[PDB]
């Protein structure tokens, strides 16, 4: 009935509350460069350094068995997964940029 659902405001509404009553902790980047060669363990090898990936979700054709080009990262550090993004975001690895962002932006 109730409960408010609205995200179109580019920004501010998420955080609105002065103590922040959640989020901030742990946080998920998109990945886009896998081009049918890119695993699991590359992407974290490089990610790693920064500091710890919790669990790797790809995004690929089940039905063939092959990787589509992107995929979700689990960082359990915020500020370590945004640095992470903050860097990768534009490197190239298997001769192809790395597409990383932060998933949500203009969802509503």
Same mark, same amino acid.
């Given at each position: 009935m109730?409960?408010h659902h609205?995200?179109?405001?580019?920004?501010?509404?998420?955080?609105?509350?002065?103590?922040?009553?959640?989020?901030?902790?742990?946080? @998920?980047l998109?990945?886009?460069?896998?081009h049918?060669?890119?695993?699991? #363990?590359?992407l974290?090898?490089?990610?790693?350094?920064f500091? @710890?990936?919790?669990?790797?979700?790809?995004m690929? #054709?089940?039905e $063939?068995?092959?990787?589509?080009?992107?995929g979700?990262?689990?960082?359990? #550090?915020?500020?370590?997964?945004?640095k992470?993004l903050?860097?990768?975001n534009?490197?190239?690895?298997?001769?192809?940029?790395?597409?990383?962002?932060?998933?949500?932006? @203009? $969802?509503?």
């Amino acid at each position: 009935m109730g409960h408010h659902h609205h995200h179109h405001s580019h920004m501010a509404a998420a955080m609105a509350n002065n103590l922040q009553k959640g989020s901030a902790g742990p946080m @998920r980047l998109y990945v886009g460069s896998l081009h049918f060669n890119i695993t699991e #363990d590359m992407l974290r090898g490089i990610f790693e350094p920064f500091g @710890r990936i919790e669990s790797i979700q790809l995004m690929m #054709d089940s039905e $063939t068995g092959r990787s589509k080009g992107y995929g979700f990262i689990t960082f359990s #550090d915020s500020e370590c997964a945004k640095k992470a993004l903050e860097q990768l975001n534009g490197f190239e690895l298997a001769g192809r940029p790395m597409k990383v962002g932060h998933v949500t932006e @203009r $969802t509503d």
